[PDB]
Amino acid sequence: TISKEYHIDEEVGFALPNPQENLPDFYNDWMFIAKHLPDLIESGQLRERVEKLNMLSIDHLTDHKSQRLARLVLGCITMAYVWGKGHGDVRKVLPRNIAVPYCQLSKKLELPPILVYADCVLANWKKKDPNKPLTYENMDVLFSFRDGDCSKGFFLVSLLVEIAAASAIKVIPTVFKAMQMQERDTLLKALLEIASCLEKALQVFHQIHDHVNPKAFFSVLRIYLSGWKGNPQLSDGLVYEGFWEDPKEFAGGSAGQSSVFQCFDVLLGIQQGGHAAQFLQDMRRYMPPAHRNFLCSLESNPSVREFVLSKGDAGLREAYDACVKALVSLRSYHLQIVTKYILIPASQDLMNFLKTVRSTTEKSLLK
Ligand SMILES: Cc1ccc(NC(=O)Nc2cc([C@H]3C[C@H]3C(=O)O)ccc2N(CC(C)C)CC(C)C)cc1
């Protein structure tokens, strides 16, 4: 079995395969701003170009990849318009001629009108040469914010984790077939292969250190990934001129927008404890609707946890634990990234919540 409807690719997983790089001509005015955000923010010319912008119909965005590219373009255009050079000069009102098409395209794609992980990681890459493989040396992003923002490194290393994970996600029907067929040797190899693929996924995380600089990240890139839900600089949210008369709050950023970590929680039958369910539930809202439909199709399958416990078989318990441990490792290395790239630069909250989820993962071990 596997996807079609859930849009999980055997090669790139939750990411979008071979994402579109160009929009229809009709949207040339958008593409010019997005493609020149580095030059236009540094010069301050960006906000005049957004305000002298006519309102474009979204009707000429006809396929999914075209519409995905347009959301990335409008989201990047939007983040730069709101935060500027980021030293107190915010815009609390997004101009109708960009907000209306952005909100319309968000309604259609069932995502919030703000830059989201499915935009600038999953849909925001190209291969440099397609005849060679998916490595940092042969990959590039479509959009950045500022020269030296380390957009390239932070987005692509993020995407390479999603790709490593695809190696494990594609093993997931074998688990359920082997349970269905009471084929014990197959399910064990499937668990060991999932564990092994999460352990190689952890090794991709090591690459952040070679392409993302903590200061460039904390003081540049993270301002353009900042949202307006619970933000003092936009206490009430952002006004989408012409689409809602009321200001609306939405979050930014967050590794929590990946589906990878929650995907393996559901599989392994790891439940959340605390009220943390609310936060993980809200993270699904910032995911594409197909990927959230997938995480639900997963809870509808028989419990792999109830299956391994019911057999009394110690090899299977050890392979299930290998996966759960590989998951605590990912959450630990996450945490360690938060220390280097946020906590330390902030000294020049989110960690308590993360520690709790890791504890719940570790407590899900069997032997
Ligand atoms: C808009 C947007 C949204 C989302 C991302 N990615 C992210 O947040 N990446 C990210 C951030 C943090 C620390 C800032 C904290 C946080 O987020 O809790 C830690 C790990 C990662 N990952 C892997 C990295 C090794 C590249 C990502 C997932 C785990 C594969 C990038 C852009």
Swiss-Prot record:
It comes from the Eukaryota. One of its GO terms (biological process) is positive regulation of type 2 immune response. InterPro entries: Indolamine_dOase (IPR000898), Trp/Indoleamine_2_3_dOase-like (IPR037217). Heme b binds at H334. One of its GO terms (molecular function) is metal ion binding. Expressed in mature dendritic cells located in lymphoid organs (including lymph nodes, spleen, tonsils, Peyers's patches, the gut lamina propria, and the thymic medulla), in some epithelial cells of the female genital tract, as well as in endothelial cells of term placenta and in lung parenchyma. Weakly or not expressed in most normal tissues, but mostly inducible in most tissues. Expressed in more than 50% of tumors, either by tumoral, stromal, or endothelial cells (expression in tumor is associated with a worse clinical outcome). Not overexpressed in tumor-draining lymph nodes. It is an enzyme of class 1 (oxidoreductase). It holds the Pfam family IDO. Its EC number is 1.13.11.52. Activity is inhibited by and MTH-trp (methylthiohydantoin-DL-tryptophan), modestly inhibited by L-1MT (1-methyl-L-tryptophan) but not D-1MT (1-methyl-D-tryptophan). SUPFAM superfamilies: Indolic compounds 2,3-dioxygenase-like. One of its GO terms (cellular component) is smooth muscle contractile fiber. Belongs to the indoleamine 2,3-dioxygenase family. Monomer. This is Indoleamine 2,3-dioxygenase 1. The lineage of its organism: Eukaryota, Metazoa, Chordata, Craniata, Vertebrata. The gene is IDO1.
